Amino acid sequence: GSHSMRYFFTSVSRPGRGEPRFIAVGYVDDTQFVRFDSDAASQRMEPRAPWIEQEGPEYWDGETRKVKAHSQTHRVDLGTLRGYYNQSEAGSHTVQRMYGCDVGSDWRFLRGYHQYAYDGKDYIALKEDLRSWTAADMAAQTTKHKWEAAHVAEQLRAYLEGTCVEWLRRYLENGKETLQRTDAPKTHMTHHAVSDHEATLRCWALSFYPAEITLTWQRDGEDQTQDTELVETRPAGDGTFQKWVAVVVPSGQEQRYTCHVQHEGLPKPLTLRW
């Protein structure tokens, strides 16, 4: 399977006083491994996974210098964008950036990406070929031209196909005990009478990793979506994820219904019957 390294950055302007609030988080697949918060006293990139603590003082120093420089970049951006969108100095605005790289099952570069948003809307993104840009509006055309002229795409491409993949591979190895371990969901069904004549069947998937999963109900071997409820996948807080899907059924007919669970942690899909 493929693996990903992604960094997420949020800067929020504080028009009343001071510099923007800046929060940066790094993930390998669905695991957070580093963070920086401008509001924290340490003013350092901090570890969030045990395997990144294998890296020495030189790592934390280098990552901190870069992440602080990135915060100043965003600070500049917030001022520039206020001007592009003719907004007043009194409202708070948001810049978000995500970038990262994937390696495939062959452990080689697969994909790179770099996306930017302003006030919750696409602004500019690097195209899949890592050579050109997609501007969502006329303001972003200005940025696209500036970045084309300064060959930003080439710089980012060299990073994405080089350093980014090299370090992802390094992290995967160092963290193999957890990053490359799949946790199959622990599944069970609960049953709740809502009356003397019908019942709710809830099919649970717990403690799974990674987050991707499919849960579906069938009745007599056909997909059933009517009269079901499916919650969004949610973090358990210990690095694993949870999901459930429920269906309401006539009392005594429970045996017709099957819960189907698909997850990379499973040799083949599971079929549950009450």
Partner 1 sequence: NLVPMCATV
Partner 2 sequence: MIQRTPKIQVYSRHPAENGKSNFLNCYVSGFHPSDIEVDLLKNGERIEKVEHSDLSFSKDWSFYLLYYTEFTPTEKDEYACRVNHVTLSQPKIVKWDRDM
Q: Which does 231 bind (CB under 5 to 8 A by kind): partner 2, partner 1, none?
A: partner 2
Reduced to 3 states (helix: H, G, I; strand: E, B; else coil), residue 72 is: helix
Which CB sits closer to partner 1, 37 or 183?
37
**Cα separation of 62 and 37, whole Å?**
16
**Backbone φ, ψ for residue 22 (5° rounding):** -125, 125
User: Which residues, in sequence order, are bridge partners of residue 260?
Assistant: 216, 271
Task: Give me the least distance between CB of 84 and partner 1, in Å please.
Answer: 8
Which phi and psi angles does 12 have, rounded to 5°?
-120, 115
Interacting partner of 143 out of partner 1, partner 2, none (Cβ under 5 to 8 A depending on kind): partner 1
7 makes contact, choosing from partner 2, partner 1, none, with CB < 5 to 8 Å by partner type, with partner 1
Cβ 81 vs Cβ 93: under 8 Å: yes
Nearer to partner 2, 145 or 186 (CB): 186
Question: Which of partner 1, partner 2, none interacts with 206 (beta carbon under 5 to 8 A by kind)?
Answer: partner 2
Q: Least distance in Å: CB of 268 to partner 2?
A: 26
Nearer to partner 1, 142 or 218 (CB): 142
Q: Write the single-letter amino acid at 155.
A: Q
- Residues near partner 1 (CB under 8 A) are 7, 26, 63, 66-67, 69-70, 73, 76-77, 80-81, 97, 99, 116, 123-124, 142-143, 146-147, 150, 152, 155-156, 159, 163-164, 166-167
C-alpha angle 179/182/186, rounded to 5°?
A: 135
Using CB distances below 5 to 8 A depending on partner kind, what does residue 99 bind out of partner 2, partner 1, none?
partner 1
Considering the complex, state which of residue 101 and residue 213 has its C-beta at the smaller distance from partner 1. 101
Give residues in contact with partner 2 (CB under 8 A): 8, 10, 12, 23, 25, 27, 32, 35, 37, 48, 91-92, 94, 96, 98, 117, 119-122, 190, 192, 202, 206, 231-232, 234-238, 242, 244
The H-assigned helical ranges of 49-192 are 57-84, 138-149, 152-161, 163-174, 176-179
Torsion angle defined by CA atoms of residues 202, 207, 210 and 213, in that order, rounded to the nearest 10 degrees: -10
Of 132, 127, 128, 163, give the one whose Cα is nearest residue 147: 132
Select 142 or 216, whichever has its Cβ closest to partner 1. Answer: 142
CA gap 206, 270 in Å, rounded? 14
Name which of 100 and 210 has its Cβ closer to partner 1: 100
For residue 131, the partner it binds in partner 1, partner 2, none, with Cβ less than 5 to 8 A by kind, is: none
Q: How many CA atoms lie within 13 A of 101 on its CB side?
A: 22
Please report how the helices 138-149 and 57-84 are oriented relative to each other, as an axis angle in degrees rounded to 10: 130
Rounded to a whole number of angstroms, the minimum distance from the CB of residue 271 to partner 2 is 22
Query: Distance from first CA to last CA of the chain, Å, rounded?
Result: 33
Residue 147 touches which of partner 1, partner 2, none (Cβ within 5-8 Å per kind): partner 1
